[PDB]
Design a protein around this ligand. Structure first.
Ligand SMILES: [Zn+2]
Length: 254
DNA sequence: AGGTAGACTTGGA
DNA sequence: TCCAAGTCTACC
């Protein structure tokens, strides 16, 4: 899920787990756990702790327990579910948090591509993967000035810049190409080649692209190669930029 | 030492 | 055979 969806998940999941106490943690794929290194340590430390809160930082969810914080990333195909321990698990379930009330918080992922890290609460923010995370795109902390500073300072493409989690949090391949199209900027453009007016415009479309998503479908370019541009009719093209598939309209973007 | 490549994972083109 | 995805860690 994208940032707006992770926020919806945060809001939806919280009341379903707040106040519950962990009685067991079952792990069917140890490598999902990145910290501590031993998945058995991860499981052991969480038992006995009660869920007190749930926050979001970019696309990461931060589950707040008594002493610890669980940092989890679903990436694109991961998903959570709260259900009864009495029912069979869904296919591809990799980690299950069992509560004392017989309910469970479950992480499933056909791609088995998610990650989890646990640290004492006070340390979470200064350790990977939250360390270095850029400002929230819908916050005052993400401004044209911030964007310009990073832009006129690197030799990378504007796309490579926007994909950088340390620049601003939350922009993956899709919102990057969409934002660039809406700002009228070619993705292969050097970040430094951007004029002041362009930076300002890009900041604006990034915020809109992020906010509009949540308080395919509605896509201008991503995955639409060979189809007419919805604004000018020119066929959308696809190329490789910053090592990623990149979609853009050669007429609308310059 | 910014910046790029590798590693992670596996259903499908 | 190889691409997709997001974000780390490994090194020119
Ligand atoms: Zn166009």
């Amino acid at each position: 899920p994208e940032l707006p969806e992770v926020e919806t998940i945060r809001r939806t999941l919280l009341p379903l787990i707040v106040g519950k106490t962990i009685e067991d943690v079952r792990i069917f794929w140890p490598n999902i756990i990145r910290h501590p290194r031993d998945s058995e340590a991860f499981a052991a430390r969480m038992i006995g702790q009660t869920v007190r809160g749930l926050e979001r930082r970019g696309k990461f969810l931060k589950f707040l327990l008594d002493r610890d914080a669980l940092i989890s990333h679903l990436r694109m195909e991961g998903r959570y579910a709260v259900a009864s321990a009495l029912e069979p698990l869904e296919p591809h379930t990799h980690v299950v948090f069992c509560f004392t009330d017989g309910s469970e918080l479950r992480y499933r992922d056909v791609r088995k591509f998610g990650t989890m890290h646990v640290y004492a609460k006070e340390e979470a923010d200064r350790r990977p993967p939250l360390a270095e995370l850029g400002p929230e795109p819908l916050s005052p902390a993400f401004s044209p000035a911030v964007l310009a500073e990073r832009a006129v300072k690197t030799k990378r493409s504007v796309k490579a810049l926007l994909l950088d989690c340390t620049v601003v949090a939350g922009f993956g391949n899709i919102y990057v190409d969409e934002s660039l199209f809406r700002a009228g900027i070619l993705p292969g453009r050097p970040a430094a080649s951007l004029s002041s007016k362009e930076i300002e415009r890009l900041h604006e479309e990034m915020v809109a692209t992020i906010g509009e998503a949540v308080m395919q479908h509605h896509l201008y370019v991503y995955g639409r190669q060979g189809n007419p541009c919805k604004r000018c009719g020119t066929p959308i093209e696809k190329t490789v930029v910053a090592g990623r598939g990149t979609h853009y309209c050669p007429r609308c973007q310059r």
